[PDB]
């Protein structure tokens, strides 16, 4: 959430999830302190290893920040 | 130019021995600041034990003093995490630096540097993380009397709240 | 379409059809057809000769958009 | 002192009954009667107000 980036040549990624073998997915839910009017959601993967970057996002969004949709 | 590859190497050697003298140095800073915090975590632990122990009006004149106590160490633990918190982001902030030395010694071919940075890394990488390991225990068991301590008073201030209905009860109604 | 047509009430008609409904054809009072600057700009177009604004007229088309815009 | 239960119910039934005839957009009614009915997370077991 940090709003300065690490270095594009850093060697470790900020965050890793080790995956269960039976895991497809991993969540990271966002909570914002009000609601905004959301335009854009940039996820920046660890360039130093694209391998570990996921393979597809699923966007939900709640209005209410309860049900997730 | 082998010369000059060689120089570059030693030069990179250079980096990668002053990044491993910053990162010992953050690492022992780092130390010493979460074995302060585990200090204030354990004496937290113990005074919310004792504060336990004085639950109710059998020591008013020593539950609030040990409140009082209690408030101090909450502050001296809080602001002890914070600051070993600065130390440890300084800490994963010469990680990263000593990493990135070993990714430039690799390329220069000063090998046997990166790999004594890359044993360092790990060597300090084991130690800082046992010294969390006891800041985790520590603040294990500082929750779990901070746990104790909740279920004693809400227990013993429930049967209190019980007994002050009964006792407006004893009285006009 | 507007260049290819035989006259200019066929393709008044489409458009005049077009803004006397709502949503998918709907009816209703407050109901109005959905403008956009690109068929705003068409519209302008089409309505871009004396020819064509006589027959916008006639073909009750300013009642029309004056009704709309109210 | 009265229930509006009533009244939503004839209004959400006048609202279903203008889908067909495109008078009522279906994602924004869905939303709306699922928002105005839990009662506030979603929940299989939940009874629609």
């Not at chain 2, 990044?19 to 979460?34: D, H, K, M, N, W």
């Not at chain 2, 220069?108 to 890359?118: E, N, P, V």
């Not at chain 3, 300013?62 to 709309?68: A, D, H, R, S």
Request: aromatic share 6%.
């Amino acid at each position: 959430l940090q709003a300065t980036p690490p270095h594009r040549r850093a060697r470790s990624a900020a965050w890793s999830y080790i995956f269960l073998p039976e895991e497809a997915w991993c969540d990271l839910t966002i909570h914002l302190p009000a609601a905004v009017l959301l335009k854009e959601i940039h996820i920046q993967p660890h360039l130093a290893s694209l391998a570990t970057c996921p393979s597809s996002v699923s966007v939900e969004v709640s209005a209410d920040g309860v049900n997730m949709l | 130019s082998l010369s000059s590859e060689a120089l570059m190497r030693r030069a990179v050697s250079l980096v990668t021995d002053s990044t491993s003298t910053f990162l010992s140095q953050t690492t022992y800073a780092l130390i010493e600041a979460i074995t302060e915090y585990t200090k204030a975590v354990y004496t937290l632990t113990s005074l919310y034990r004792q504060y336990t122990s004085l639950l109710g009006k059998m020591n008013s004149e020593e539950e609030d003093e040990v409140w009082q106590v209690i408030i101090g160490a909450r502050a001296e633990m809080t602001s002890k995490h914070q600051e070993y918190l600065k130390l440890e982001t300084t800490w994963m902030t010469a990680v990263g630096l000593s990493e990135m030395a070993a990714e430039a010694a690799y390329q220069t071919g000063a090998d046997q540097a990166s790999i004594t940075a890359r044993n360092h890394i790990q060597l300090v990488k084991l130690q800082v993380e046992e010294v969390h390991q006891l800041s985790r225990k520590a603040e294990t068991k500082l929750a779990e009397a901070q746990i104790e301590e909740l279920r004693q008073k809400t227990q013993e201030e429930g049967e209190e709240r019980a007994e002050s209905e009964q006792e407006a009860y004893l009285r006009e109604d | 379409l507007s260049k290819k047509a035989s006259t200019v009430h066929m393709m008044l008609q489409p458009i005049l059809t077009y803004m006397a409904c709502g949503y998918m054809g709907r009816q209703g009072s407050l109901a109005t057809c959905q403008l956009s600057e690109p068929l705003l700009w068409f519209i302008l177009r089409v309505l871009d000769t004396s020819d064509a604004l006589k027959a916008f007229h006639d073909m009750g088309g300013v009642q029309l958009i004056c009704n709309n815009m109210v | 002192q009265l229930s509006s239960v009533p009244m939503l119910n004839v209004c959400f039934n006048k609202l279903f009954s203008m889908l067909q005839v495109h008078h009522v957009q279906l994602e924004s009614l869905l939303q709306l009667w699922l928002t105005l009915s839990l009662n506030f997370l979603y929940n299989a077991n939940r009874i629609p107000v």
